[PDB]
Every structure is written in C-alpha cells, then in structure tokens.
Amino acid sequence: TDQAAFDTNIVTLTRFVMEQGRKARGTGEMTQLLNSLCTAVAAISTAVRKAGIAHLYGIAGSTNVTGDQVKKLDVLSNDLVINVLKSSFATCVLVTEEDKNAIIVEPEKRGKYVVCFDPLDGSSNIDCLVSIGTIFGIYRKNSTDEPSEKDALQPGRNLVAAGYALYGSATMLVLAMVNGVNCFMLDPAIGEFILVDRNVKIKKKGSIYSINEGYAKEFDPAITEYIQRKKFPPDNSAPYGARYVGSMVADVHRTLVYGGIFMYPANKKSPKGKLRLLYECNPMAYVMEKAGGLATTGKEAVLDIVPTDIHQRAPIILGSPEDVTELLEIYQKHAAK
Amino acid sequence: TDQAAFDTNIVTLTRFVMEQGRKARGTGEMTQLLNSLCTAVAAISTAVRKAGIAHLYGIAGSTNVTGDQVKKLDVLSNDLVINVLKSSFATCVLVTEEDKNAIIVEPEKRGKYVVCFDPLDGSSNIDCLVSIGTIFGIYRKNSTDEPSEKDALQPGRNLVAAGYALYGSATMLVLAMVNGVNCFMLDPAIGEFILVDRNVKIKKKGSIYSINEGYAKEFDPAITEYIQRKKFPPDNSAPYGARYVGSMVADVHRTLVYGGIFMYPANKKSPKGKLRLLYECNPMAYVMEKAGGLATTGKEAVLDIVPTDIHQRAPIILGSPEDVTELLEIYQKHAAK
Amino acid sequence: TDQAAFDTNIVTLTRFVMEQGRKARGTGEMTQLLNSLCTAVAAISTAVRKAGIAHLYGIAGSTNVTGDQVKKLDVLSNDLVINVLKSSFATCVLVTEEDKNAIIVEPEKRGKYVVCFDPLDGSSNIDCLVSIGTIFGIYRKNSTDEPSEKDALQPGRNLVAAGYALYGSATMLVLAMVNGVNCFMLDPAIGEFILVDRNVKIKKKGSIYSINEGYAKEFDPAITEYIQRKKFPPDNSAPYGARYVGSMVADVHRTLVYGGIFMYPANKKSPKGKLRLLYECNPMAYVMEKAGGLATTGKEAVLDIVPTDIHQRAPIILGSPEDVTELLEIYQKHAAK
Amino acid sequence: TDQAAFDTNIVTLTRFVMEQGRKARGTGEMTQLLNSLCTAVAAISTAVRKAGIAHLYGIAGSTNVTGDQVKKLDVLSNDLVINVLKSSFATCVLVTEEDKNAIIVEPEKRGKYVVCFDPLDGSSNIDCLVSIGTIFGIYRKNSTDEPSEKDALQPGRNLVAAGYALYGSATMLVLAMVNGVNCFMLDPAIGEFILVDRNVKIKKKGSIYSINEGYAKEFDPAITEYIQRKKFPPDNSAPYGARYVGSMVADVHRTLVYGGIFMYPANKKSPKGKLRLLYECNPMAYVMEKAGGLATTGKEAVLDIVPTDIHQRAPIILGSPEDVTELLEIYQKHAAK
Numbered sequence A, B, C, D: 001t002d003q004a005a006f007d008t009n010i011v012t013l014t015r016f017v018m019e020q021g022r023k024a025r026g027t028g029e030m031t032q033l034l035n036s037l038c039t040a041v042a043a044i045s046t047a048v049r050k051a052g053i054a055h056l057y058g059i060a061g062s063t064n065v066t067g068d069q070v071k072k073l074d075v076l077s078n079d080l081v082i083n084v085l086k087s088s089f090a091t092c093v094l095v096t097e098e099d100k101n102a103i104i105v106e107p108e109k110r111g112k113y114v115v116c117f118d119p120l121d122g123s124s125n126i127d128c129l130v131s132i133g134t135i136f137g138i139y140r141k142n143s144t145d146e147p148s149e150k151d152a153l154q155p156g157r158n159l160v161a162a163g164y165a166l167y168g169s170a171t172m173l174v175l176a177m178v179n180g181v182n183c184f185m186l187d188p189a190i191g192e193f194i195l196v197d198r199n200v201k202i203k204k205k206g207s208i209y210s211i212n213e214g215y216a217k218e219f220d221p222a223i224t225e226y227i228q229r230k231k232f233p234p235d236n237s238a239p240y241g242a243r244y245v246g247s248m249v250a251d252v253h254r255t256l257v258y259g260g261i262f263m264y265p266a267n268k269k270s271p272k273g274k275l276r277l278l279y280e281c282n283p284m285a286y287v288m289e290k291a292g293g294l295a296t297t298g299k300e301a302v303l304d305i306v307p308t309d310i311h312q313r314a315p316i317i318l319g320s321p322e323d324v325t326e327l328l329e330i331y332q333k334h335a336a337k
Ligand SMILES: Nc1ncnc2c1ncn2[C@@H]1O[C@H](COP(=O)(O)O)[C@@H](O)[C@H]1O
Pocket: A017, A018, A020, A021, A022, A024, A025, A026, A027, A028, A029, A030, A031, A034, A140, A160, A177
C-alpha cells in the first residue's frame, strides 16, 4: 500500500486468523476451527521429530515402551486431529484418510463445518526420514438434515479454506482461503507460526516435472509424449530438471515455490489414480488455484468433480499454468471416443 | 553373551563413541573429534529448523537488526563446523566445499586428523523445506612435513571414520568406522543422539533406482540401457519404483535404508559428474561399502580414486550390491575404446 | 455441572481467551491484546532460559557477541512487550516499569486499552538464577481526550483483566478477569499454554508469612507484633513456616497456591514501600481479590487507591483472608492520630 | 600463556570433562560417569519443565491414559538417575534418598564408584514452580570386599567429585572436583551444558543470611544471638538482607554466587538438623569448601563427620568465610557443657 513512517510488524498465524475473521465479520466458529488445526499441526510436528524418542529406548529404563508394533505415528496423528477438532465445537463431520467411515460429531460438540483430512501423509516413508505432511480441507455444512456422511461429498470448488502442513527440514503451514495463499512457518523455540510469505502466486512456467517415471510402461500416450518433450526438448532449449520425493506434500510444495509441474496420472492398477479426492487432491488443487496455477485430471478439472464416495481416488496434474496448459493440449490431441 | 532375553537400553552417541575409543586404546584425541563434530551437527540441525526465526521477523523488534550472527545457513554452518573443529585440538587440515582452499589449523589448535566436510548439502534446495544434510570424512594425517592441502588428497580407502547428518522430518546421524555403520537419532527434547540402528547392512537387492532423468538426453548408453531395464523389465517382472529427492544425503540415506541404487554419472554438461569427491563422494561410498553395498563410478571404485585436486568431482553409482553389479555389467557390455 | 457421557477436553489459553471473549460478545479488540501478551510471555520465557546462550559464547566463533554490558534481558523484554503490544492494534497507552514516561501509541495502531506492565521482574536476581516473572494490568480507556499519560492513573478497581507470568522451574501464566483466576501452563515442546487450574480460590488461612525480616529494625510496631505472633504463637499451636524468595512473582504465586501471607510494609528508606502501584501491587492485588484473598496497604486497600504518578510506590500486604484480617486488626489496635 | 587478548570460546561440558580425565590419565571410567550423570540431569530438567504436559491433559486424547512412563517427578527422576548410572558401567553402590536401602549394582554393570544422590531436592516445593534441583556426591570405592552400604559410609573429606543441578529460570550445573568449582549453563536450544563460570570462588563476606525464622522458637542461643546481630548490627552498620527460598539448591546456589550464609541447625523437632548428610550436606559442603567458604555444623566441619548410617541427618551452616566464622565465635561464646 502507499505511505507512512516506522512499521516493523510480526504477523503470527493466530493474529492473522484472528484479524482475517474479524474482517469477514464472522462469529468466530471458524476462527476456532482454524486455531484447533494450528495446535494439531504443532503437536504432530513434535511427534514427527521423535521428541521423547529417548523414553521408548530405555532412558527411563525401557519401562513398557517398545518401537515396532506399539504407538504408531499415524494413529496418534489421527487421534490428535479428531480429538483437537471435535473439541473445537465447530465441526459436525470428520472424513479422514485413516478412518473408513465419516465421523459424525456428538451433538454436544457440533459445529457447522465439515473437515476432510489426511493426518499423516507419506507416513510410510518416515523410516527413510523423508518429508511427510498433513493435508486438510474445510467445507461448510450446506444441508439441513442431520450431518450425514453425505455432507462431505462436495466439489472442491465448495471449499471454504484449505491447506497443508509440511514437516520437512523445517515445518511449514500453508493456508489458502478465498482471498489468498499464505505460508506461515513454525519457530519451535516459541511455538508460533510466523507469516514468512504473504499472497503466494506461482510461476507461469517452470523447469521441473515431478512424476514417478517407473510407471512408464503403463502411462497413457499423452503423458509419455509430455515427458519425452521435457527430456528431449524440440526447439532445443534446456530440458526440464526432474524431481520425485515420493511424498505429495513435498512435491506439491516445491511445485508451489519453484514452479514446475506435478503429475500422478491414471495407470492400470490405479486407473483412477492413487491420490484421493476429498483429502489429498482437492485441498492441493484448491491451493494451486488460489496461487494462480492449475489442477486438472487431464480431461476435466479437480475442483469441479462431484464425489460419490468419500474415499474415491482421482488422477491429478497440477503446477505452473503454462506447463499444465501444455499437457492439457497434448491430452486434447489424443482425446477421442 | 550369557543371559539376556529380548533386551535394549538407552545408548547415547557420546557414551557410544567413548567406549569405542576405550576399546582401541586411543589417546582420546579422536573421541574429542567425533565429540566436537557432533556438537556442531546438533547445533546446525537447530539453525536448519529455522528455530528462532520469530525474532528475525520483528517479533523482538529488529532494533537496527539483531542476532548473534545467524545469516546464510551454509555460511554459518561452514563457520560452526570449522569452529568446533579447530577448538577440538584434533585437526590440522580442514577442507570445506564453501572454501576455495584447504584450511590449515594453527599450531595451537593443531591436532593430527585431516577432516573433509560439506557443511550443508542441499543448501539451495533448502527453500523447499526439502531435506538437507552435512557430510564429513575423516583422515589420519600421514606425513612428516607441514600439514597442507596434500594431506587432504588421500584416496577414500584411507578414511578412518565417515558419516553424514540428515535434517529431515527427523535429524539422523550415520556413523561408519572400521566395524560398521551405526545410526543415531537426535532426540531434540533432551538434545542427545540415541542409538537406534546398530551395524546397518544394506539390502542385497532393492526395488528403486534414483537419478535425474532430466538429463536423459546426455546419458551414456550403459546408463540409458539400464534405466530401460528397470522401467520395462526384459523378464516381464514388476518394474522399479523411482524416487529422486534431488539431495544426496536424502537419497543416499533412502538407498541405505530401503535398498535400491543411486546414480549421478557424467554428461554433456559435467564430464566428470557433479558430485565432489573428498566431501560427498568418498563419505557416502565409505558408508555404502561399510553397509554392504558398492560405490562404483562406472569403471573404477570411488574409494580407490587418487585425488589430484581437493575440489575434484566424480560420477558415482552406489546402492544395493546386486543392483550396482547389474549396471556395471551393462557398462562392460558397452566397452569403451 | 450435572450429567453426560465421554468428555476428554484440552483447553488451550488461546481457545479459552477465544471462547471467553465470544461469551462476552465483545468485538475482539481485547482478545487480540490477550493473545499478543500470550506471545510476549513465551518469547521472554525463551530468553530467560538462555536459549541460544551458546552463540554468545563462541559456538559461532564468539562473533560479535559478549555477555556483560551488551544485550540485557530487561531491555529485550521491554522491547518485545512494547513491540508485540503496539502491533496488537488494541493499546493506546503503555506504562512500563522500565520506561520513565507513558508510551502513547501512534494513531495508526491505536486501541481502546491502557496496559501497565513490569517486563522482567526480579531481573536483578537472575544471576542467582532465582525465579523472575512478568506482571501486567489492563484498563480500558474511559476518557475522550487524546490518550494522555493520565489514562493510566486509575484505581486498580478499574482493571479489566490482570495477571502475571511466572518463569520458575516451569512457566506459568496466571490470568484473572471479572469471573475468575485461571492458571495456564506452558508446554514448551508445542508452545502452548494448557489450563492446568481453573477458578483458583485461595485458602482462608495459611501457615507461611513472607517478608524480608532483615528490615526488623525499621518495621512498624504493628508488623513487629504480627511476626512475633507467627514465630512464638500465643495459644501454642504450630508456628508459621517462613519464606522469602526475594522475587515478588514467586512469593505472590506461592501465596496464591499454598496460602499464607505476603508483606512488603513501609519502612524509612521507602516509607511508601518499594513496590509500585500501577504494575506490581495492583495487578497482584487484583488477582488476590478474584481468588478470594485480600490485598491491603495495612490501613486502606490497594485497589481503591487513586494514583497521581504512574511510578508511585505503595505498601502491600496480601494473602489468605484470615491471616490478612489478623494483621489488619493489629494495625487498628495501634492506629491513631 | 603466550599471546591471547580478551578471548573466550565455546566449551561444552562433555569436552570439558573429557580433557580433564585426559590430564590425569584416568582409564576413562569416571568420564563415563560424569557423562552419564549429566545426560540424566539434562533429561530431568526437561521432565521438570513440565514439557509435554499437553498430551497428559487430553490434547492427544489419553486413550486409556498414555505415556512412556512420566509420573511422580521425584520417582521418575530417581529412576532415570539409577538407570543412566548402572548403564555407565562405573557404579557399584548407589544411595538414593527416595530409597530406603543402598543400591548395589549387579556385577555386569558393576563399576567402582559409590554415588550418592538426591534426585530431586525441593520435590514438594515443586507445585509453586519454585526451583528444584538434583544433588550428587561421588566416592571412589575403598575396600576389597563385596560392595555394600558400608562403601557409602565415608566422610565427605573422601569425595572425588560433587555438584548439583538447579532447575530454575535456567538449568545450571555446578561441578567441583579437586581443582575447583565450575558452573555450566544448559543451552536447551542445542542441549549442551556450556561453561559460563570457571573456577568459582565465593565472597569472603556477603550481605545476606538465610534461615527458616519460622523456627525462631526452637533456636539454640548462638544462632538466636547471631540473627540478632544481623538485624540490628552492634556497630550500627547496614543490616543484612534476608532471603529464604526454602530449597537448598537455590539457597546454596544463591549463597555461592552472591555471598552470604545458609543455616539449617538443630531444633526441638529435629535435634540433628533436617538435612541428610550423604546426599545434601556433603555435596554442598564440598562445593562450598572448594569455592572458598566453610561448611560447619556448629562445632565440627561437615566433611569430617564419619557416617554411622546412610540416611543420617546433620545441621549445617555454610557460606562466606568471614560470616561462618562469626557465627562460630558466637557458638564458642556460648560454650556447651
Ligand atoms: N479466520 C477466518 N478467515 C477467513 N474467513 C473467515 C474467518 N473466520 C470467519 N470467516 C468467514 O465468515 C464465515 C462465517 O464465519 P463463522 O461464524 O465463524 O462460521 C466463515 O465461513 C468464513 O467464510
């Protein structure tokens, strides 16, 4: 904005979420929900860096603790999130990756908000200590009937706020809402998320493609062509550098920052893709969009899809708009009846 | 062994290292080195976790800017290492990537070990919260003359200890020395590395190849032919998964743990590979060979190469043994003249 | 309250402050202020445990850091609080122990709240590592004229919320408002204050008197008598155990928990007492009251005093109601013209 | 000394201890002991900071209650110490306050040093966030027979190392051994004790007496007469300040640093003082004498007392030297028959 004097400002998530809600002039039911997520993320971060790992390994004498088939990070995560969220008194339906059925919040603690989440993502690949994260999407209950599992089933286009928490070399909470995508970072010493990036928009074109090339054998022709074009470029420019961490949060996030494109196409084994719609694809699609990028299934678009199963998968391609445009055309070229 | 069922107790790094040096009646000058290097790691992890960022963003009101010097991470890291090193009174020649020349420790702090390190690998891939690390290789001075750069130029086969710390969703330290490879997890809550994996041995055969396929264009046939046999197996068996975090510590680490192979061979833009020998190549190689795998370059083994220059580069291929011998064969099948 | 089923609840300060404000049906200007204090307390706690002390002492090479006459805990504290508070956009006047004049917040950031505070209390006695704390009192600007220093000058009875943060063996934030006194405790691992005590009320009678007996020579007769009665009890019961930490927050807090009584009478040197009215006595008096205890100057009562100097001192006696009643009578007995 | 202006660099405990043992060619069995004991402290500090309380209050949803065993602090502490101790392979007889008998380390872990500790002094004064601590005194086994309780019964004069860790607004470790007393500050951020005060020597004469005047009734004349000379000095000089935190580590610590004296003499309810000799009295005494002060009991010196029982008690008077010799005189002036 235009002019003044001395302004040294430190925006903390809680402050932001607070201000933002007041402008919205909303009651604060959400703002509660938003803070409850904030706390889940920080406690999960602590679990993820294996704080207290010493007790499990005999510092306290190896009491009753043992690392193998006992306290797993997933369950704990799902426990926290569901707990910390019900007590927010703002949710009426929790749809989680780890929980088969849609959780319907007991009336005493009901709220007008549906929350779809993946407590710990890439959690398998924690043994290799690779970057995992938490993804979430929030919808507002637009029904009138008792909060049925159905209330989750809404196009991503209906999201009221979405985002993910990356537990990489440092912990980042990316939040996206109507007006923008903002990245807040955790300062562990004081347990606070500081706005380190405001109104994040993604590069028009990038120089990285992210895909598990090992499925080459089963990739569709349109994809095969796109990739070859990145490796061996026609006009003889620089080829695209490749990346594949193997963790959705890590790839989407790097795509959001350096640009480039991510893809997890349909292949026979998962002809509907591996990634889920409600709590993986959608929240990420939503962020890409608010950032100025594109999330497409290759033929249609992620957010316009209308779910029929809370656990339904979907292909997903998202990244810089210009790259994703390039791949969408190649799909057109090959598209037929 | 006499009587001890399924047992296991707390074992810190410090204690671990300590008894190891007792076992082989060392003067205790090296213990002081592993001791020091470790303190360095522990602290760097913390700088890497952007812990304390709050103050840096005005929460403390950057008066006229503040801090006890916390700038470019790789620069402060570089400092921190060289610092707790000289003060170990166990080093004579320190070689850093971030340093054009070799460092020759003044006579006061002058020890006897030559130490090579890459203070922060992935230093640029940092903005993405994508795992970074620290690599160090230790050499025993072998000469009579004044320590200098030449004392650093010894083939990897002459290493005495070698490891790397990986800053990811957890901070892990891997330490290999004559007996084997031992992984210590940093329990941040109490600031101590705990022994979680002792005597690590690698998978004879994994299901993952790792490489920047962005360079497929500049790939020598053997490589190019190998990648193919993984994507589309000749014997119509399940194809290899692919994973490229784009950070050596993370990929070398994933390959150590989960099995598989890692490739960073020569190309049109880098005839001798991109990876530096003394501080990236030999350490990973040493760990690898001590873990049970191989570390070839295509035709010769990493550890035998005799260094003509401290900042020398080299192509590298390391991983499971059955896997690295397959690519070697392919490399033999395509004999060069 | 009466009946239900399964209720496992974790109340975090932020949540509490949030809920409480909604019931109040207030806009949220305060709630902002309340959270801004919450963050100051946590950052100061970090400074108090000397986190990063290593950098000042050469880990980073003793860069430009030196411990003596450089970065002091007081100033830093006062810097944070004033900073973090102005940016709350909820304060128009800050009266601090460490700042001679009443700070008048620049219009861009003005709010309808006056905040009186002692950034670091007992800060002198930190060398002996003894318990220090932060005290604060909040008044609502009841004037109409430009926020003049005068706006601070209001009887403690006019406080809208008050409390203190103890940085003892563990960090506690005690908050008091119209409806009650609640103690929240910091879990450093996740940077969150959990309600560990709800609606704290103090014991009618105690068994500890807290006073610097070294001033015996100059104590008034009424005090001299009270003390002798604790030491040598008339009715031959158990004498009172004595305590004197030398830090107001530590004594007031232990008085609030185990009961007993605190005193810091007038003596010739400080015939008006040592403790200040606006940001030491008043906030503590206010807490004692809401807890069911009493804060008296010996003749009148702390909260009814009407200030004329923002830095004016005042005697103060506070603790269990029955003990403080006992001492008030003894003052009556001796009181005259 | 040769050339070094006003200089100072980072010095960790570990490094410090390490070189100390090198200097006096120890087998390194004791280094392993100071090493171990320290890890214990570091961890206890953390349990004492109630860090992790969140989960304990349902944030993680105490499923059917959880934890890696974190109960009564003094009980877990007691455990932790005895644990990292046996596993040091440096202890034969461990004596704990919380333990009715002496612990005799099994032959496998059986070392040679006898270790006496009070795992958590102030354990009850904890609810008030009032500083607590840990005290330990080390004895070298002197016998040929089977280690047992008698090996613990040696006068304080035969101690080899002694110290205490104080958990207050900071975690400090004080270590005294033949050469002197050295204070190490715990920098929690990186989990390492840093040398802040080397070779501490106490004030010949302080301005603070310390004692539970609640017991004035049961005070022996010399004491009673001494307290008077401080409150109302005969030579009409400034009176002594008084401070009684009601926790030995905090008061012994304040007295070490700021000067002054500390008294816990006999009385009607405790003819032999309340403080236990082996784990509270001798350590503080040793530190005191090594700091430059005295530690008398009234007529004989603490360190010479020969223990008839491990849980023996003793009155104690320690502090500045000129101060402790004044009370002694007074104690001589009131000769007992
Ligand atoms: N913290 C916030 N950030 C952005 N929008 C908000 C926020 N709080 C409330 N709103 C908007 O106003 C609506 C109503 O708020 P509520 O009464 O709390 O449910 C929310 O669904 C949002 O669309």
